[PDB]
Amino acid sequence: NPWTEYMAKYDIEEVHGSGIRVDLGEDAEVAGTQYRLPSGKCPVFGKGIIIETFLKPVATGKDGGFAFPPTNPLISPMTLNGMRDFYKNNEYVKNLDELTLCSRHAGNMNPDNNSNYKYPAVYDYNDKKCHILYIAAQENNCFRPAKDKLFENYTYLSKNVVDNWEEVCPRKNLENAKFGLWVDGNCEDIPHVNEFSANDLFECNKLVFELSASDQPKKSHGKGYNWGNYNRETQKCEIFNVKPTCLINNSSYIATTALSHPIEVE
């Protein structure tokens, strides 16, 4: 299989290793109490929390969001330039990409009296700000995780986001391409898919996310309906839960994943 190296980033169970829709793949203790917390190794592009907004500071002392309360010095929210300046003496941190840097910055804040509880974070590409999430919960349905037009520039980050996610994690959608399974020198179609109707790529990506690996009933370890072949002509989102191992050239298709950005194509 000549697709091995290229298709490696789409082995989400391996490269992400946790829930996508709801990421709670690890447990950490704070002062003798066990808490669940995100642990996915890949960034989730376009993911936010809908409250029936969540980047607002959490209520201290209940009309607030999930983000960190004001501090001195204010470390959340913090711009990319603010973070790089804050770690200007740390060569192991100052040159990290914006997503990994946001993750390491969030994981720097220990609320314990040397535990391993590290807050999840959200990087907003719009104004280039890193928001440390004080609330690691993602669904209580009251709130729910979702991909939305309002969330297209958000990026949900766990503590385990790898510094080379650009190389090993999905981001772009593959235009004129179709996920398949490599069998005997040929790339065959996914034998069984679950067809959901979708107006565009965004809606297809939203559906895949909704059906994707979840560590909470509405640990997955990355298992789930994480992939989708979107036929832009028949407007069908073909969703499946087995990892693809090759690509089929088809101008009618766009290959998307739950981790992938809802809009960007390549």
Binding site: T71, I75, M109
Partner: peptide
Amino acid sequence: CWTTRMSPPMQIP
């Protein structure tokens, strides 16, 4: 309220 894990360790209230 928090203490930075990475050196130098400073306490942000």
